[PDB]
Amino acid sequence: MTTLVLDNGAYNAKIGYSHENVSVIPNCQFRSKTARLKTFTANQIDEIKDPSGLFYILPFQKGYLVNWDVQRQVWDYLFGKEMYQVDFLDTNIIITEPYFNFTSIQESMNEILFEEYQFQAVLRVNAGALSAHRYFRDNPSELCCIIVDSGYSFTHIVPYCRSKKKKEAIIRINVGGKLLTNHLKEIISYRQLHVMDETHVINQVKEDVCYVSQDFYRDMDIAKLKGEENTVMIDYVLPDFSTIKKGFCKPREEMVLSGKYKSGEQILRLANERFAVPEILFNPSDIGIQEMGIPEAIVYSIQNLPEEMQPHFFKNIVLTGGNSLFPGFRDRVYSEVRCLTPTDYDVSVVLPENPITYAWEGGKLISENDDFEDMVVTREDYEENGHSVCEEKFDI
Amino acid sequence: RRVLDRAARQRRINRQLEALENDNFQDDPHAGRKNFQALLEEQNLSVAEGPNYLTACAGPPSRPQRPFCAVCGFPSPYTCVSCGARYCTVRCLGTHQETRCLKWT
Amino acid sequence: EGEVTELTPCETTISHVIIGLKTAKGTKQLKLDPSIFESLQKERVEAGDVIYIEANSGAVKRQGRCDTYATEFDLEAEEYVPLPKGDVHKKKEIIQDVTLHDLDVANARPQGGQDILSMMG
Amino acid sequence: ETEIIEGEVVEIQIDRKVGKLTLKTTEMETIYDLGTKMIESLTKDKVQAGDVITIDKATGKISKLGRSFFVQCPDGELQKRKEVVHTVSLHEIDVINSRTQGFLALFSGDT
Amino acid sequence: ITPGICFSTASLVLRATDVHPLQRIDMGRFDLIGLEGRVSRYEADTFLPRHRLSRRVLLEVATAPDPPPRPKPVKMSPFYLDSLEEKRKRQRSERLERIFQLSEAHGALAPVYGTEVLDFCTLP
Ligand SMILES: Nc1ncnc2c1ncn2[C@@H]1O[C@H](COP(=O)(O)OP(=O)(O)OP(O)(O)=S)[C@@H](O)[C@H]1O
Ligand SMILES: [Mg+2]
Numbered sequence: 020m021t022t023l024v025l026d027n028g029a030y031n032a033k034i035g036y037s038h039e040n041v042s043v044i045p046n047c048q049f050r051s052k053t054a055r056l057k058t059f060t061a062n063q064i065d066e067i068k069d070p071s072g073l074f075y076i077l078p079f080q081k082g083y084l085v086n087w088d089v090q091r092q093v094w095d096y097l098f099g100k101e102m103y104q105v106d107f108l109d110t111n112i113i114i115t116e117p118y119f120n121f122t123s124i125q126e127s128m129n130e131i132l133f134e135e136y137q138f139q140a141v142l143r144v145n146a147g148a149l150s151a152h153r154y155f156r157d158n159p160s161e162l163c164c165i166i167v168d169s170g171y172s173f174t175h176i177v178p179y180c181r182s183k184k185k186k187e188a189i190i191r192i193n194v195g196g197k198l199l200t201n202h203l204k205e206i207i208s209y210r211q212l213h214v215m216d217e218t219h220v221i222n223q224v225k226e227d228v229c230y231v232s233q234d235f236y237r238d239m240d241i242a243k244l245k246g247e248e249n250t251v252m253i254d255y256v257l258p259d260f261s262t263i264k265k266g267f268c269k270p271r272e273e274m275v276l277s278g279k280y281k282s283g284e285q286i287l288r289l290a291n292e293r294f295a296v297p298e299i300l301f302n303p304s305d306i307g308i309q310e311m312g313i314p315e316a317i318v319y320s321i322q323n324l325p326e327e328m329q330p331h332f333f334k335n336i337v338l339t340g341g342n343s344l345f346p347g348f349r350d351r352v353y354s355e356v357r358c359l360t361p362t363d364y365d366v367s368v369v370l371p372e373n374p375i376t377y378a379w380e381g382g383k384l385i386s387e388n389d390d391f392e393d394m395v396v397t398r399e400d401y402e403e404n405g406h407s408v409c410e411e412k413f414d415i
Numbered sequence: 416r417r418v419l420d421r422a423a424r425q426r427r428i429n430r431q432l433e434a435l436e437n438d439n440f441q442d443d444p445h446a447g448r449k450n451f452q453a454l455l456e457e458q459n460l461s462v463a464e465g466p467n468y469l470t471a472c473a474g475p476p477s478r479p480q481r482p483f484c485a486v487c488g489f490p491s492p493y494t495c496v497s498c499g500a501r502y503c504t505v506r507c508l509g510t511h512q513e514t515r516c517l518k519w520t
Numbered sequence: 521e522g523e524v525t526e527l528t529p530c531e532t533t534i535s536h537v538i539i540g541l542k543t544a545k546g547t548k549q550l551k552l553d554p555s556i557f558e559s560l561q562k563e564r565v566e567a568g569d570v571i572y573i574e575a576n577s578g579a580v581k582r583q584g585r586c587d588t589y590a591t592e593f594d595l596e597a598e599e600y601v602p603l604p605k606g607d608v609h610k611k612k613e614i615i616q617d618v619t620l621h622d623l624d625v626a627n628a629r630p631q632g633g634q635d636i637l638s639m640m641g
Numbered sequence: 642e643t644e645i646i647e648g649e650v651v652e653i654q655i656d657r658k659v660g661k662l663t664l665k666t667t668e669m670e671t672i673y674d675l676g677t678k679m680i681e682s683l684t685k686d687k688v689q690a691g692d693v694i695t696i697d698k699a700t701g702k703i704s705k706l707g708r709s710f711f712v713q714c715p716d717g718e719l720q721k722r723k724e725v726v727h728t729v730s731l732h733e734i735d736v737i738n739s740r741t742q743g744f745l746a747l748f749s750g751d752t
Numbered sequence: 753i754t755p756g757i758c759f760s761t762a763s764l765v766l767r768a769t770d771v772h773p774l775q776r777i778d779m780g781r782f783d784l785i786g787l788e789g790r791v792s793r794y795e796a797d798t799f800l801p802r803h804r805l806s807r808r809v810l811l812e813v814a815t816a817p818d819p820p821p822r823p824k825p826v827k828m829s830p831f832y833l834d835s836l837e838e839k840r841k842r843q844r845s846e847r848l849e850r851i852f853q854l855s856e857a858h859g860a861l862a863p864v865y866g867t868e869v870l871d872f873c874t875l876p
């Protein structure tokens with residue numbers, strides 16, 4: 020009857036019903052030193068009041084599901100009586116998978132979904148396929164599109180035709196939100212104060228203060244200055260979870276140059292990390308990763324494809340994922356791609372209002388279609404043909 | 416002063432890059448199944464055997480690497496002789512030598 | 521005008537030279553008369569160099585290396601120049617005043633010439 | 642503004658072109674990765690270990706100002722950004738731009 | 753043996769006479785002394801007036817297909833874009849017009865003397 024759309028990401032699971040809204044819930048368990056024997060599951064992290072020193076139990080290592088017990092527990096909580104009360108025997112599930120998912124992981128997914136839960140039908144796709152379907156629904160005149168999925172654990176770039184994914188031109192960049200957060204942790208620990216146990220707070224700081232610079236060396240020169248002219252430098256007050264619940268940035272008028280404050284607030288001063296961290300997406304070699312950045316990879320992926328299709332792909336660059344929410348990300352990507360693109364070809368980069376939920380919206384749209392029943396694999400057909408037909412139907 | 420061979424520097428760079436993928440830096444507060452490498456070795460994944468995880472990896476960048484100071488992050492004209500780390504000023508060189516040159520404190 | 525991304529002479533002698541120039545507003549592929557290859561070789565033009573070519577005369581000036589390559593070595597005796605901002609192909613209609621004396625002195629002595637007498641002159 | 646590198650040469654290596662150069666001051670020491678043009682410039686002007694030299698980065702202009710064990714080794718930063726001010730007369734501009742190698746006429750008449 | 757004199761000047765001084773190509777006209781249309789020893793009276797008077805290209809011939813040759821290969825000696829549209837093609841054909845038209853204008857400009861001048869006159873008048 021009903022259809023469940025799930026984006027089993029390594030950081031956030033986009034789970035919701037086709038007839039309802041979308042919810043963003045962390046897809047990992049939590050443990051804290053304020054609880055002796057208590058493991059938090061999924062959105063229960065809101066209950067804790069001192070997220071400092073939080074321990075993360077992740078089901079994904081390097082963007083692929085490797086820990087099955089925590090993932091099973093998270094799914095049981097999400098599918099349980101508390102969250103959604105999913106009727107497994109009469110529900111279809113659309114669940115996303117990482118690109119080039121290993122054969123073993125696919126077999127385990129099929130077995131778990133068809134036996135441990137006994138879903139009526141399963142449709143396993145890629146988040147980029149849903150994003151491409153949503154984009155083609157929004158723009159019916161476009162025949163080809165390229166999807167940029169800058170997520171938690173990686174950044175893929177995949178070009179899609181009207182009804183097919185070009186597996187030959189798929190390029191993966193091993194830079195994601197996890198890497199950026201860890202790099203910011205390492206920088207802050209090495210420079211000002213040890214925060215390697217404060218993943219949550221450093222992630223919030225990155226989400227709040229970091230931005231993509233249009234002119235890297237101009238910003239570096241501005242940051243190197245001292246005094247009023249150092250407009251890049253800002254002061255951040257870390258949350259102590261006693262009187263300051265959440266971190267915030269001090270107003271510029273309230274800034275003190277000397278760095279000493281009468282209030283005993285633990286103030287973390289970030290000047291060049293504001294744009295150094297986001298720059299790793301565009302220049303992986305900045306930190307030591309000998310891989311091409313996002314714009315060069317987009318250009319390479321397009322230029323691998325035949326010449327006739329290239330102008331269409333250059334016109335339909337789509338930015339999805341959490342890392343795409345950096346200020347100036349779209350402008351920087353457009354500028355670099357325009358610099359690299361042939362002048363006769365127009366370049367258009369589109370950043371949706373909610374890049375997090377793009378794949379979930381695409382899944383909702385594809386569920387409503389009249390071709391939905393042909394895409395899914397049923398349990399009755401699973402009994403006999405499943406193990407072959409799951410690989411056959413799904414274009415992973 | 417001592418000099419570190421290419422193997423030591425490459426090992427340090429690989430360790431630093433791998434540490435960025437770590438879930439947590441601390442241990443389990445409770446204090447009392449595979450991994451990615453096991454999955455890769457189980458897949459027996461061979462290069463040029465069709466599109467796969469390895470063939471999807473991004474190639475080397477054309478633009479050269481830009482040096483940044485290992486201490487403060489600003490651009491670094493200088494390269495430390497002992498360990499190959501980049502640095503930009505006498506103060507930064509002293510801090511690097513005290514903190515992370517030779518022995519990894 | 522722009523940064524050189526490719527410099528490939530096409531053999532039949534050389535029929536033509538295909539060059540790739542990059543700017544902030546895109547990339548353009550140009551086919552050059554084979555006589556321009558000598559000028560390109562004299563100016564020592566390689567990939568990554570920022571050059572300009574006059575369409576009417578074929579003159580080539582290599583105006584430095586692109587500043588994106590400034591970090592390829594820690595110490596080179598190179599002059600690094602920003603990437604040109606406008607289009608690769610630049611057209612300008614100009615009105616310049618010259619005097620008859622300018623044409624007289626332009627035609628009083630020869631210019632260039634690879635002969636030994638011209639060089640000694 | 643120009644970038645000027647002044648220090649004492651520690652080791653110079655050239656192999657069949659790539660090369661490395663190690664320079665030191667009294668406060669810091671550094672290894673440089675050399676380009677082809679700087680390798681040619683350092684080969685043309687014989688530079689050996691112990692010489693105190695200054696290099697103009699943009700031009701490769703290397704001038705040896707002595708040897709140290711005679712001039713004391715430089716103290717501060719190895720690479721310094723300096724502001725150089727030149728007052729050039731209109732006559733000097735005219736003579737330099739009059740012909741190729743025309744600056745010679747500033748010293749030998751012949752204008 | 754003395755070291756040379758190192759004369760240092762402002763880098764801006766060496767660019768005083770330099771003029772950007774977009775800011776100066778082509779002086780090769782008045783180059784008469786450069787034509788001596790290279791251009792003949794035959795080329796200027798008999799050949800070029802007869803065998804100058806026209807826009808019609810240039811367009812016909814450009815539009816026509818490639819010529820058939822020379823015989824060996826014998827011993828005896830879904831992805832089509834209209835705007836892109838319009839831009840490309842406009843560029844081709846501009847290229848052909850430039851080729852015509854440059855060919856006309858580079859053979860407009862006749863030598864003052866010519867190779868034949870100089871050869872005749874040059875004794876051993
Ligand atoms: N406003 C923001 N600014 C910067 N980063 C942000 C922001 N909001 C979220 N993020 C980061 O975005 C990342 C999560 O992106 P997601 O799209 O949810 O990743 P994901 O879908 O789980 O990744 P995969 O590869 O598809 S499994 C996290 O690292 C967040 O810290
Ligand atoms: Mg995702």
Ligand SMILES: [Zn+2]
Pocket residue numbers: 484485486487488489502503504507
């Ligand atoms: Zn520094």
Ligand SMILES: [Zn+2]
Pocket residue numbers: 495496497498499500511512515516517
């Ligand atoms: Zn060191």
